[PDB]
Amino acid sequence: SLALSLTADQMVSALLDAEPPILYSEYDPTRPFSEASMMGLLTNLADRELVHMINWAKRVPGFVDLTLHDQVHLLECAWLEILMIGLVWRSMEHPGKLLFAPNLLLDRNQGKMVEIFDMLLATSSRFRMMNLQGEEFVCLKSIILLNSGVYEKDHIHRVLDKITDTLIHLMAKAGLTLQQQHQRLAQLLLILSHIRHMSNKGMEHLYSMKCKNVVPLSDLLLEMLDAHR
Amino acid sequence: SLALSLTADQMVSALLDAEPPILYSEYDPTRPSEASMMGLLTNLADRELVHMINWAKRVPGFVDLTLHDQVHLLECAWLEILMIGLVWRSMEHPGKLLFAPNLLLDRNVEGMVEIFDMLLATSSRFRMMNLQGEEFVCLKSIILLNSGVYTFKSLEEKDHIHRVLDKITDTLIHLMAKAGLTLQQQHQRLAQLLLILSHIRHMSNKGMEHLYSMKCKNVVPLSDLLLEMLDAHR
Amino acid sequence: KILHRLLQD
Amino acid sequence: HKILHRLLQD
Numbered sequence: 096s097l098a099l100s101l102t103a104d105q106m107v108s109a110l111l112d113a114e115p116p117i118l119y120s121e122y123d124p125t126r127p128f129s130e131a132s133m134m135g136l137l138t139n140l141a142d143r144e145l146v147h148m149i150n151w152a153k154r155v156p157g158f159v160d161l162t163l164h165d166q167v168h169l170l171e172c173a174w175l176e177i178l179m180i181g182l183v184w185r186s187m188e189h190p191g192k193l194l195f196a197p198n199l200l201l202d203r204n205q206g207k208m209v210e211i212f213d214m215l216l217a218t219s220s221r222f223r224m225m226n227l228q229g230e231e232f233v234c235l236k237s238i239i240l241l242n243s244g245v246y247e248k249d250h251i252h253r254v255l256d257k258i259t260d261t262l263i264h265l266m267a268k269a270g271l272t273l274q275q276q277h278q279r280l281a282q283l284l285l286i287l288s289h290i291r292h293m294s295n296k297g298m299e300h301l302y303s304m305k306c307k308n309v310v311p312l313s314d315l316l317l318e319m320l321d322a323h324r
Numbered sequence: 325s326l327a328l329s330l331t332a333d334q335m336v337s338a339l340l341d342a343e344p345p346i347l348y349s350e351y352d353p354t355r356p357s358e359a360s361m362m363g364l365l366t367n368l369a370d371r372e373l374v375h376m377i378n379w380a381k382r383v384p385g386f387v388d389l390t391l392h393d394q395v396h397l398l399e400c401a402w403l404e405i406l407m408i409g410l411v412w413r414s415m416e417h418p419g420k421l422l423f424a425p426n427l428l429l430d431r432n433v434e435g436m437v438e439i440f441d442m443l444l445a446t447s448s449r450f451r452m453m454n455l456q457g458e459e460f461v462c463l464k465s466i467i468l469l470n471s472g473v474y475t476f477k478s479l480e481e482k483d484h485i486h487r488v489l490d491k492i493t494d495t496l497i498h499l500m501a502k503a504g505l506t507l508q509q510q511h512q513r514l515a516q517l518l519l520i521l522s523h524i525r526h527m528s529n530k531g532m533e534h535l536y537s538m539k540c541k542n543v544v545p546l547s548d549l550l551l552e553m554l555d556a557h558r
Numbered sequence: 559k560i561l562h563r564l565l566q567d
Numbered sequence: 568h569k570i571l572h573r574l575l576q577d
């Protein structure tokens with residue numbers, strides 16, 4: 096596994112270069128106030144993002160070393176967390192708003208869940224107040240990928256330790272003191288517990304709309320959704 | 325505030341002597357099912373909640389919060405605190421979950437078995453890391469303060485909770501440093517401990533929806549307090 | 559609520 | 568029979 100032999104900077108550059116693009120939603124400036132048009136716009140976006148996520152996961156150090164079934168399981172567990180932490184990241188510069196796409200900016204009044212919506216905004220505000228850097232973001236997202244479905248197993252724990260070293264290395268380069276390092280390290284990882292929470296509540300929210308035939312979901316998105324049952 | 329001005333050793337000792345007792349179940353080896361089991365666990369959890377509430381009051385900085393805040397933090401993390409306690413108790417019983425000193429169960433209704441295995445994996449995870457009691461009482465306190473710091477005018481401290489969470493983090497590092505762990509090992513172990521909290525969150529969320537379906541089907545009844553805790557996640 | 563009661567007592 | 572199986576090989 097070349098991931099363990101990588102340096103902290105080599106780890107960063109690998110994760111940064113593996114970054115999936117910021118996709119656009121279907122245009123037409125009609126502000127979605129319906130439940131069908133809303134989810135139809137988000138389902139189409141998420142489905143296209145899933146394709147980039149899969150190829151992004153392959154370029155994550157240590158992920159390719161796993162078996163195919165392990166790669167499947169890990170992606171099945173964390174695909175919504177990864178989508179959400181990406182959404183939250185994009186929504187940083189827009190307080191009280193969620194930037195699903197550059198041409199799709201939604202606020203709390205578009206709730207038609209609002210509870211999960213507010214949790215996403217709170218997470219976005221938290222990242223903004225902590226001044227989350229891009230190098231820190233790609234490390235957290237990688238952790239989510241490897242940690243969420245970690246239940247051979249040592250390898251994932253070794254890479255997770257490697258990302259931890261990478262996170263600390265970034266903070267030390269930012270001039271952070273010894274105490275500010277492990278503190279910020281703790282603050283970043285505790286948010287991952289909330290991302291997990293929003294994901295679980297999101298899943299059952301997606302099971303209900305699937306159990307209502309509201310919007311035609313894709314087969315891929317259905318299989319990802321079916322895995323959490 | 326009594327907190328924040330507390331040293332790391334003062335923090336540890338305060339969390340240790342605030343520990344709730346390990347209660348017994350109503351299990352009878354002679355008596356026969358999955359229904360009676362959940363009834364035994366429901367009765368156990370209900371009695372554990374009373375001790376958890378008084379335990380939370382002795383958590384540094386918790387009583388500094390408003391009453392409506394304290395309610396929210398417990399409503400969101402009561403199952404998480406219960407689970408990490410269960411996992412901690414079952415640490416020395418491989419393949420078994422120690423719900424009570426008289427109730428030690430193994431994997432032998434689907435969906436509940438998946439949660440059972442996730443609880444075992446976490447228990448196995450604590451065992452391979454050689455988790456200390458001083459580390460556990462810190463982790464459990466973090467769960468109490470962190471799990472509901474979001475989902476809460478100008479308000480706020482939320483900001484005090486973040487201040488206390490930093491203190492507990494400093495405390496965790498102080499413990500690892502006293503354990504002879506190198507500066508690198510301290511950061512890795514810290515990350516390892518907090519990543520487990522994401523799993524505890526997950527198991528809690530799946531536990532709630534299982535508890536919600538059990539409610540909307542009668543059979544095993546829930547106590548009045550346990551019912552109001554459950555409605556908080558709906 | 560009961561939780562609100564016990565926390566207050 | 569999963570689509571995720573195919574996409575992880577492409």
Ligand SMILES: Oc1ccc(C(=C2CC[C@H]3CCCC[C@@H]3C2)c2ccc(O)cc2)cc1
Binds near residue numbers: 141144178179195208
């Ligand atoms: O089929 C879907 C799969 C995922 C999404 C998605 C969600 C899930 C549900 C809603 C809940 C409240 C508001 C935002 C989230 C995002 C989401 C999240 C982040 C993205 O970047 C894109 C889609 C929506 C539909």
Ligand SMILES: Oc1ccc(C(=C2CC[C@H]3CCCC[C@@H]3C2)c2ccc(O)cc2)cc1
Binds near residue numbers: 365366369406407436
């Ligand atoms: O010390 C503890 C006591 C009880 C619980 C608790 C659990 C844990 C075990 C899992 C196993 C199957 C599915 C749900 C239960 C929930 C539980 C069970 C039944 C209830 O009515 C409430 C909580 C967790 C920790």
